[PDB]
From Swiss-Prot, chains A, F, H, K, N, R:
Residues of this chain annotated as glycosylated in UniProt: K6
Protein name per the record: Complement C1q subcomponent subunit A
Species in which this protein is naturally found: Homo sapiens (Human)
PTM summary: O-linked glycans are assumed to be the Glc-Gal disaccharides typically found as secondary modifications of hydroxylated lysines in collagen-like domains.
Domain notes: The C1q domain is the ligand-recognition domain, which specifically recognizes and binds the Fc regions of IgG or IgM immunoglobulins. The collagen-like domain interacts with C1R and C1S proenzymes.
Assembly information from the UniProt record: Core component of the complement C1 complex, a calcium-dependent complex composed of 1 molecule of the C1Q subcomplex, 2 molecules of C1R and 2 molecules of C1S. The C1Q subcomplex is composed 18 subunits: 3 chains of C1QA, C1QB, and C1QC trimerize to form 6 collagen-like triple helices connected to six globular ligand-recognition modules (C1q domain). Interacts with CR1 (via Sushi 24 and Sushi 25 domains). Interacts (via C-terminus) with CD33; this interaction activates CD33 inhibitory motifs. (Microbial infection) Interacts with Staphylococcus aureus protein Cna; this interaction results in the inhibition of the classical complement pathway.
Localization: Secreted; Cell surface
Residues found modified as 5-hydroxylysine: K6
Annotated positions of the 4-hydroxyproline modification: P12
Related illness: C1q deficiency 1: An autosomal recessive disorder caused by impaired activation of the complement classical pathway. It generally leads to severe immune complex disease characterized by recurrent skin lesions, chronic infections, an increased risk of systemic lupus erythematosus, and glomerulonephritis.
Role of this protein: Core component of the complement C1 complex, a multiprotein complex that initiates the classical pathway of the complement system, a cascade of proteins that leads to phagocytosis and breakdown of pathogens and signaling that strengthens the adaptive immune system.
Residue stretches of biased makeup (Basic and acidic residues): 1-11
Swiss-Prot record, chains B, E, I, L, O, Q:
Subcellular location: Secreted; Cell surface
Record's disease association: C1q deficiency 2: An autosomal recessive disorder caused by impaired activation of the complement classical pathway. It generally leads to severe immune complex disease characterized by recurrent skin lesions, chronic infections, an increased risk of systemic lupus erythematosus, and glomerulonephritis.
The organism of origin for this protein: Homo sapiens
Coiled-coil segments: none
Gene this protein is translated from: C1QB
Lineage of source species: Eukaryota, Metazoa, Chordata, Craniata, Vertebrata
Modification note: Hydroxylated on lysine and proline residues. Hydroxylated lysine residues can be glycosylated. Human C1Q contains up to 68.3 hydroxylysine-galactosylglucose residues and up to 2.5 hydroxylysine-galactose per molecule. Total percentage hydroxylysine residues glycosylated is 86.4%.
Shown part of the complete sequence: 34 to 46 of 253
Protein name: Complement C1q subcomponent subunit B
UniProtKB/Swiss-Prot annotation, chains C, D, G, J, M, P:
Oligomer status and interactors: Core component of the complement C1 complex, a calcium-dependent complex composed of 1 molecule of the C1Q subcomplex, 2 molecules of C1R and 2 molecules of C1S. The C1Q subcomplex is composed 18 subunits: 3 chains of C1QA, C1QB, and C1QC trimerize to form 6 collagen-like triple helices connected to six globular ligand-recognition modules (C1q domain).
TM ranges: none
Full protein name: Complement C1q subcomponent subunit C
Compartment(s) of residence: Secreted; Cell surface
Disorder: C1q deficiency 3: An autosomal recessive disorder caused by impaired activation of the complement classical pathway. It generally leads to severe immune complex disease characterized by recurrent skin lesions, chronic infections, an increased risk of systemic lupus erythematosus, and glomerulonephritis.
Post-translational modification: O-linked glycans consist of Glc-Gal disaccharides bound to the oxygen atom of post-translationally added hydroxyl groups.
Modified residues (4-hydroxyproline): P3, P6, P9, P12
Domain notes: The C1q domain is the ligand-recognition domain, which specifically recognizes and binds the Fc regions of IgG or IgM immunoglobulins.
Organism: Homo sapiens (Human)
Chain's role: Core component of the complement C1 complex, a multiprotein complex that initiates the classical pathway of the complement system, a cascade of proteins that leads to phagocytosis and breakdown of pathogens and signaling that strengthens the adaptive immune system.
Gene name of the record: C1QC
Length: 13, 13, 14, 14, 13, 13, 14, 13, 13, 14, 13, 13, 14, 13, 13, 14, 13, 13
């Protein structure tokens, strides 16, 4: 069961 | 066992 | 066996 | 059994 | 029972 | 039945 | 029975 | 037949 | 009766 | 019979 | 054979 | 006759 | 016979 | 074998 | 011969 | 034999 | 051996 | 097993 990658959150500024 | 997709990330503060 | 998709990354702030 | 996809998050205002 | 995809979110006010 | 995640709405400003 | 995908929302003007 | 959701148009400004 | 995907929305005027 | 996906709309100029 | 919708081009400015 | 996906649109001039 | 998906166009510079 | 379309690169400025 | 998806384009210089 | 999807490119900084 | 999808790239520093 | 392409990271500025 090859499962997907989880995305990154954006950065502050 | 078929695979599950990943969750998309959020915009940052 | 079918494989899964991956997610997208969020956008930066301001 | 095939699994489902997830949604995207909206964009911030101005 | 095959799965249902999720709804995309809206742009903010 | 693994169902998908619902997206977030955008923020105000 | 395979289910369908949903659409994306457009971008605001300027 | 679970059918998909239609997207919203953008707003004017 | 397999399902049909939804149409994406347009950018606003 | 499997159905197809639709396309995205381009971004406006400047 | 339910076929997909073609996208719109962007506008000038 | 399985279906064919649509072409994405271009950014405007 | 299952068909394939198409790609997205890049964003312009500044 | 109906194969997909390749995307365009962005423009300079 | 099942079909192959296309490559996404790059951001411009 | 089902084929896979490709990824998206990130956005430039500021 | 069914195929695996690719990972999306990150926003730059 | 035709596998997908990996995306590029963004550029600095």
């Amino acid at each position: 069961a090859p499962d997907g990658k989880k995305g990154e959150a954006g950065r502050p500024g | 066992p078929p695979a599950i997709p990943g969750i998309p990330g959020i915009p940052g503060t | 066996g079918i494989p899964g998709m991956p997610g997208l990354p969020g956008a930066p702030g301001k």
